[PDB]
Design an enzyme around this catalytic site. Sequence first.
Site, short mmCIF file in Angstrom:
data_model
loop_
_atom_site.label_atom_id
_atom_site.label_comp_id
_atom_site.label_asym_id
_atom_site.label_seq_id
_atom_site.Cartn_x
_atom_site.Cartn_y
_atom_site.Cartn_z
N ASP A 263 -9.66 -13.46 -42.94
CA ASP A 263 -9.81 -14.72 -43.69
C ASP A 263 -10.76 -15.66 -43.08
O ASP A 263 -10.44 -16.31 -42.16
CB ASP A 263 -8.64 -15.39 -44.26
CG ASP A 263 -8.87 -16.66 -44.95
OD1 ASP A 263 -9.90 -16.93 -45.25
OD2 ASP A 263 -7.73 -17.40 -45.01
N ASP B 271 -15.17 -18.73 -47.88
CA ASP B 271 -13.46 -18.37 -47.82
C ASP B 271 -13.24 -16.72 -48.22
O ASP B 271 -12.98 -16.70 -49.43
CB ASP B 271 -12.67 -19.37 -48.53
CG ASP B 271 -11.32 -18.79 -48.09
OD1 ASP B 271 -10.85 -18.64 -47.04
OD2 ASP B 271 -10.51 -19.23 -49.07
C1 LIG Z 1 0.61 -21.30 -50.64
C2 LIG Z 1 -0.15 -20.26 -50.47
C3 LIG Z 1 -0.47 -19.64 -51.81
C4 LIG Z 1 -1.18 -18.59 -51.91
N1 LIG Z 1 -2.55 -18.89 -51.87
C5 LIG Z 1 -3.43 -18.15 -51.45
O1 LIG Z 1 -3.38 -17.01 -50.77
C6 LIG Z 1 -5.05 -18.56 -51.44
N2 LIG Z 1 -5.72 -18.19 -50.17
C7 LIG Z 1 -5.41 -18.64 -49.10
O2 LIG Z 1 -4.42 -19.50 -49.04
C8 LIG Z 1 -6.09 -18.13 -48.08
C9 LIG Z 1 -5.28 -17.02 -47.29
C10 LIG Z 1 -6.29 -19.45 -47.04
C11 LIG Z 1 -7.69 -20.16 -47.25
O3 LIG Z 1 -8.48 -19.43 -46.58
C12 LIG Z 1 -7.45 -21.79 -46.76
C13 LIG Z 1 -8.86 -22.36 -47.20
S1 LIG Z 1 -8.70 -24.08 -47.20
C14 LIG Z 1 -9.99 -24.78 -46.92
C15 LIG Z 1 -10.57 -24.48 -45.62
C16 LIG Z 1 -11.12 -25.53 -44.79
C17 LIG Z 1 -11.64 -25.31 -43.13
S2 LIG Z 1 -10.53 -25.78 -42.00
C18 LIG Z 1 -9.52 -24.35 -41.88
C19 LIG Z 1 -8.01 -24.82 -41.64
N3 LIG Z 1 -8.30 -24.98 -39.98
C20 LIG Z 1 -6.92 -25.54 -39.45
O4 LIG Z 1 -5.83 -25.74 -40.15
O5 LIG Z 1 -7.14 -25.85 -38.28
C21 LIG Z 1 -5.85 -26.04 -37.45
C22 LIG Z 1 -4.51 -25.19 -37.71
C23 LIG Z 1 -6.05 -26.32 -35.96
C24 LIG Z 1 -5.36 -27.46 -38.05
C25 LIG Z 1 -7.01 -23.52 -41.62
O6 LIG Z 1 -6.94 -22.86 -41.04
N4 LIG Z 1 -6.94 -23.58 -43.09
C26 LIG Z 1 -5.97 -22.53 -43.58
C27 LIG Z 1 -4.50 -22.57 -43.19
C28 LIG Z 1 -6.09 -22.16 -45.08
O7 LIG Z 1 -5.19 -22.49 -45.83
N5 LIG Z 1 -7.33 -21.85 -45.40
C29 LIG Z 1 -5.55 -18.01 -52.83
C30 LIG Z 1 -5.49 -16.60 -52.62
C31 LIG Z 1 -4.79 -18.29 -54.11
#
Ligand SMILES: CCCCNC(=O)[C@@H](NC(=O)[C@H](C)C[C@H](O)[C@@H]1CSC/C=C/CSC[C@H](NC(=O)OC(C)(C)C)C(=O)N[C@@H](C)C(=O)N1)C(C)C
Length: 377
Positions: free
Chosen positions: A220, A35
């Site tokens: 990402d 990731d």
């Molecule tokens: C509430 C958000 C607070 C901020 N947090 C963050 O920014 C964090 N980083 C993130 O969240 C990343 C930007 C995202 C991170 O890579 C996370 C990794 S979660 C573990 C990943 C598993 C693989 S399936 C991926 C999924 N696929 C999906 O949803 O497909 C459909 C839409 C068709 C259902 C998807 O897309 N997930 C997105 C949404 C997401 O959350 N990805 C960290 C920096 C702490």
Amino acid sequence: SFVEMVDNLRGKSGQGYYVEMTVGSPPQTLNILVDTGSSNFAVGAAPHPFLHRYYQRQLSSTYRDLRKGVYVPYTQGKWEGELGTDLVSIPHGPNVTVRANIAAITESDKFFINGSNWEGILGLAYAEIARPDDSLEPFFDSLVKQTHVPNLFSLQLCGASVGGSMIIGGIDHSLYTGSLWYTPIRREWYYEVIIVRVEINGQDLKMDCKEYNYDKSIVDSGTTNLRLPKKVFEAAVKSIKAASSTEKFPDGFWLGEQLVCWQAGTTPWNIFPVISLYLMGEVTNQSFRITILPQQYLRPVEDVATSQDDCYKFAISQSSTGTVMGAVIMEGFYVVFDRARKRIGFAVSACHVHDEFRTAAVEGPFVTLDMEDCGYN
Ligand SMILES: CCCCNC(=O)[C@@H](NC(=O)[C@H](C)C[C@H](O)[C@@H]1CSC/C=C/CSC[C@H](NC(=O)OC(C)(C)C)C(=O)N[C@@H](C)C(=O)N1)C(C)C
């Protein structure tokens, strides 16, 4: 010696890409999701309906408890656990062993996916976004400080049930064709970049470029879709609808909800437009573009019925946290995360998408004035 790292990634469509790793002594094998959108290294460390295995700290003699809890929220899913350190290695990666921070996941919500085959996550972004704070050194930072591995990695994600390569410490020139085009990493927290222009079927969306980067744009690998800010998402969908007005699709389709199907081998690709994202380049008033084919933003899904027809889901969704260039965008491209030179490189992948009359591409140079005004503050 990158040949041993080629094809070291596996996964299922829309479930993320993972690499094999080992932690503790004796070594415990686990599949870890790659990731680039996070900076925490964490693994399931307790029983779970979706986990076939997990990290057992009591079985590792090199394990060290940091006595400090941690919580990490993601766009979708979240978990909490205990911080600690242990020895880690990558079987199909560089032949080294380093002591890195590891979060033992004790509780989670909508994080682990049933049948994903991975039990952990490897955040490859910078310490600035690491939880609980930037003091928790990320895995890659540890790897680079404890070994001689160069400060960069590259990802070649291949679509379809899915595979790819994560070259740690370098670039494998046999994995891409043509030239690599680089865009500056704006700031070292997420892998943040600046989009300076967007075209659909060669038609400029005509929007203030700041809108494309509101409130940021990141690369990402852990996100499946291309996520666009509300205003951009709306303009994009409108343009894509008009281009495909020939046929009619349920309103739930454009929301990622419902899926569309077609007779095996009759998908009207030609009615769906290519999308061009122009990225800030390395020299003054210069940019380059990457072109996305419909075969990329139309993720194939299993027929919900007993039919043998090709069904797909719209892989472009609305975002409230900025643009996200997810796996569907990275697929077909070889992406170099050149941390040493603060830049990200893109080139056409050897496992690129295939269309009869069109082709994904990375093209340059282009002249673009006032690119700095595209960055949001
Ligand atoms: C509430 C958000 C607070 C901020 N947090 C963050 O920014 C964090 N980083 C993130 O969240 C990343 C930007 C995202 C991170 O890579 C996370 C990794 S979660 C573990 C990943 C598993 C693989 S399936 C991926 C999924 N696929 C999906 O949803 O497909 C459909 C839409 C068709 C259902 C998807 O897309 N997930 C997105 C949404 C997401 O959350 N990805 C960290 C920096 C702490």
